[PDB]
Structure 1
Amino acid sequence: MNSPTGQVFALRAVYGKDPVAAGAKEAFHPMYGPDAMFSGQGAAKKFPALA
């Protein structure tokens, strides 16, 4: 590093109409699979969360 204090960006692919939101799931995540129906039924209806 030639100048003090480097920096590195990070581009998250975030979905749900808010690239920044509270708990906006990340799109392409090695951990986390893509939400199975988001493009699909999950746009037509909203499913009850499980708790």
Structure 2
Amino acid sequence: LIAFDICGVQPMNSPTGQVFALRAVYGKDPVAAGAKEAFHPMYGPDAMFSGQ
């Protein structure tokens, strides 16, 4: 078998635990239709946002 060679573990200390994450977003509204992240890898940065 391939025990964990290609995976993470993050073992529990509580059953049924939780994980979190944080996204950097722009336009002063953490939750909005059309909201975009500052650094998503598949999308270029808005060079004009900080510019013209």
Quickly name the TM-score band, shorter chain normalised.
0.5 to 0.7
> What do the CA deviations read for 1:5-37 (whole angstroms, capped 9, x no partner)?
111111000100101111211111111111120
> 1:4 — aligned with what?
15
Aligned 8 A contact 1:14 1:26 in 2: yes
CA RMSD of aligned residues (A): 1.1
Equivalences, count: 41
Higher helix share: 1
Runs of 4 or more consecutive aligned structure 1 residues displaced over 3 Å after TM superposition? none
TM-score of the two chains, using structure 1 as the length reference: 0.67
- Residues in 2 aligned to 1:11 and 1:5: alpha-carbon distance in whole angstroms: 21
- Residues in 2 aligned to 1:23 and 1:6: alpha-carbon distance in whole angstroms: 31
TM-score of the two chains, using structure 2 as the length reference: 0.66
Structure 1: segments with no counterpart, 5+ residues:
42-51
Percent of residue pairs bearing the same amino acid type:
100
